[PDB]
Amino acid sequence: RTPVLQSTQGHVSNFSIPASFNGNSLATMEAVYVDGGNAGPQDWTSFKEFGYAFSPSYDANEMKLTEAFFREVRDGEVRLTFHFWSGETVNYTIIKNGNQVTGIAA
Amino acid sequence: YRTPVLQSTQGHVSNFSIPASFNGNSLATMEAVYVDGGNAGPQDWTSFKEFGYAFSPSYDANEMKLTEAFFREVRDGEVRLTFHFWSGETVNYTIIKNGNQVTGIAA
Structure with missing residues (x-):
């Protein structure tokens, strides 16, 4: 089953992606820049x-990306892949300008 | 032009969403002051x-989110929120915070 993610606009200090949990449990997340290169803490x-770097907030139907995560993101465009206890992956795009971040669902 | 608008609700500071129609408008900003005066929320x-x-509209879900960071800077009590749209026009809403619980009352 693939319940899944909304586009949003937020701040680096408490960025949350609205997320329909109901389905799955999150296993991990990858982050890479659009034009290649690992993004985020641990290059x-x-x-x-x-x-x-990230944590699911099942109660609140949110994916949190932490401030520590964004500290290691160069301004620009990043693709996130969320891996669930298989079912299966879900891509998401983030654009970071300074403290502002826009999230775009696939 | 038009004012689609807000429901009363009850929640926790961690999450809190005000049910909201969306349409008509797009949100421009939100003010928050204590009823008895004083700016409320982050940035006194x-x-x-x-x-x-501090807040974000969730158009697809017909919700106004007030974040946990917002509430962390709200002293327990009563706060009036004024939502400003692009433009049409403002909409008042009342929140009562007690510890981790919050009640929202529509105008």
Whole structure:
């Protein structure tokens, strides 16, 4: 099953993507720049750290991307891949300008 | 022109969403002041709160989100919110915060 993600506009300090949880449990998230390169904390991997960089908020139907995550994102466009306990992946695009971030669902 | 608008609700500070129609409008900003005076929410120096940080419209879901960060800077009690659209026109709403609980009352 693939319940899934809304477009949104937010701030780097408490950015949340509205998310229809009902379905799945999140396993991990990758982040890469559009034109290649791992994005976010730990440049040596595309896969980010649960809790530190991102965390699902099942009660609130939100995916949080933390401020620590955005500290390691160069202004621009980033594609996120959310991996669930299979079912299956879900892409999402984020555009970061300074403190502003726009999120675009696939 | 037109004023589609807001429902009463009850929630927790972590989350809080006000049911909202959407249409007509697009939100421009939101003010928050205590009933007894004083700017409420993050940035005491202005009544006008920060779009995206303190609040955000959720057009697809017909909701106004007030974030947890907003509430962290609201002293327990009663706050009047004034939502300003592009433009048509303002809409008042009352929130009562008690600890982690919040009640929202429509105009």
